[PDB]
Design a protein around this ligand. Structure first.
Ligand SMILES: *[C@@H]1O[C@H](CO)[C@@H](O[C@@H]2O[C@H](CO)[C@@H](O[C@@H]3O[C@H](CO[C@H]4O[C@H](CO[C@H]5O[C@H](CO)[C@@H](O)[C@H](O)[C@@H]5O)[C@@H](O)[C@H](O[C@@H]5O[C@H](CO)[C@@H](O)[C@H](O)[C@@H]5O)[C@@H]4O)[C@@H](O)[C@H](O)[C@@H]3O)[C@H](O)[C@H]2NC(C)=O)[C@H](O)[C@H]1NC(C)=O
Ligand SMILES: *[C@@H]1O[C@H](CO)[C@@H](O[C@@H]2O[C@H](CO)[C@@H](O[C@@H]3O[C@H](CO[C@H]4O[C@H](CO[C@H]5O[C@H](CO)[C@@H](O)[C@H](O)[C@@H]5O)[C@@H](O)[C@H](O[C@H]5O[C@H](CO)[C@@H](O)[C@H](O)[C@@H]5O)[C@@H]4O)[C@@H](O)[C@H](O)[C@@H]3O)[C@H](O)[C@H]2NC(C)=O)[C@H](O)[C@H]1NC(C)=O
Ligand SMILES: O=C(O)Cc1cccc2ccccc12
Ligand SMILES: O=C(O)Cc1cccc2ccccc12
Ligand SMILES: [Zn+2]
Ligand SMILES: [Zn+2]
Lengths: 160, 160
């Protein structure tokens, strides 16, 4: 569904959450472009189950994560050579933050075997324009744009 | 002193908090322009003590709040009158979100007597350009710009 709501105070617990077909994910856009009218920043609340990973991807915007619960590993590559290259792998834990430089290819993995990972994610220039890589050797020109992304599809179609 | 941190993954409990001379405030810039190099978004973590309030102010950027703990009241003024005017009082509670229209005058109040209010705040176009009002009756044209703001003064002076 597309749930639009521009009032000023909104209850996060009442904004319908979904995996959008991504196994192990639970997503809520807390404040965003297509659902609420934002123009410069957008905020997501996401929970990833044990062992799950996001796809390898990039987006031409700033992006900041804050870890509410759980632990994991951040994988990041470079945006300057013709492909991402073998990534940096950096562990993170509850109450850590990390920002992804514009266009850097990255992946977030919930490497804990038992607890869910819950983060707040903030982006600039919404909505997100995510290009997907199938592995760290795929060249940057070859990444596939998936726009709108699955949590924006219903509202993107409703706004034409 | 100015604390600059060029690290990718940071522990938020080790970024130094301060009131910056604002009674009942505790602030940490989680990811920002002067402290970490951000250009498009900046993220703060703020705790306000029971009864305390931010000054009445406005800023030419988007601003989104997410309430992590506690509860309170958002006070919103007019951007169409020549002054903010008597404010609308909008209650908010744990797990709510609110976005402040660009340039609207507002104040956040911890109207709870029992527990601290903690919020994650996101702004666009950092660092903040905050104009202060002495009361809801002050004309928009008389509001005073305080730049750099108190949590940016040390790095702004160090930058020279
Ligand atoms: C991730 O890590 C984060 C960082 O560690 C965590 O957030 C922090 O959580 C702390 C633990 O709960 C939390 O500590 C509480 O701070 C509040 C809020 O504080 C201020 O006001 C206090 C109370 O005030 C009044 O009385 C005073 C005398 O009693 C008067 O002086 C005053 O004017 C007023 O009327 C003040 O005592 C306090 O003041 C000072 O403290 C500053 C340091 O904060 C100094 O700069 C200053 O000189 C002086 O020492 C504050 O201004 C308290 O009310 C409460 O009892 C705890 O101290 C802290 O605030 C949180 N930080 C932020 C930025 O939010 C977070 O929880 C972690 N999250 C996860 C998921 O793990
Ligand atoms: C502020 O409000 C927030 C919103 O209410 C709240 O955050 C919510 O908190 C709840 C409670 O803790 C969380 O619920 C937890 O969700 C996790 C993770 O869920 C996802 O993964 C599970 C497990 O997946 C895998 O295992 C299954 C087998 O069981 C496989 O099929 C699968 O492939 C994987 O291997 C999965 O079952 C979930 O899927 C279902 O649910 C989604 C909806 O989320 C449907 O769309 C889907 O079709 C299906 O029914 C999902 O993919 C779960 O494991 C836990 O058991 C528990 O349910 C929410 O995740 C969380 N929401 C967000 C967005 O983070 C805040 O906590 C609250 N905060 C405060 C301060 O109060
Ligand atoms: O922008 C990010 O890194 C978040 C993110 C981007 C793309 C796909 C995702 C799937 C599941 C969870 C998060 C995801
Ligand atoms: O509404 C805001 O921009 C945050 C904010 C702006 C100005 C002063 C403040 C004092 C204490 C806590 C937050 C404050
Ligand atoms: Zn990303
Ligand atoms: Zn403000």
């Amino acid at each position: 569904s597309c749930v639009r709501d521009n009032s000023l105070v909104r209850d996060i617990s009442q904004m319908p959450q979904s995996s959008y077909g991504i196994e192990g994910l639970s997503h809520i856009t807390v404040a965003g472009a297509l659902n609420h009218g934002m123009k410069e920043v957008e905020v997501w609340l996401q929970t990833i189950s044990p062992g799950q990973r996001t796809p390898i991807h990039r987006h031409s915007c700033e992006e900041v994560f804050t870890v509410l619960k759980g632990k994991g590993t951040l994988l990041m590559g470079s945006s300057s050579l013709k492909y991402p290259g073998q990534p940096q792998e950096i562990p993170f834990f509850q109450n850590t933050t990390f920002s992804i430089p514009v266009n850097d290819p990255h992946q977030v993995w919930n490497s804990d075997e038992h607890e869910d990972l819950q983060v707040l994610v903030i982006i600039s220039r919404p909505p997100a324009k995510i290009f997907l890589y199938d592995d760290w050797s795929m060249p940057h020109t070859a990444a596939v744009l998936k726009f709108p992304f699955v949590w924006d599809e219903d509202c993107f179609e409703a706004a034409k």
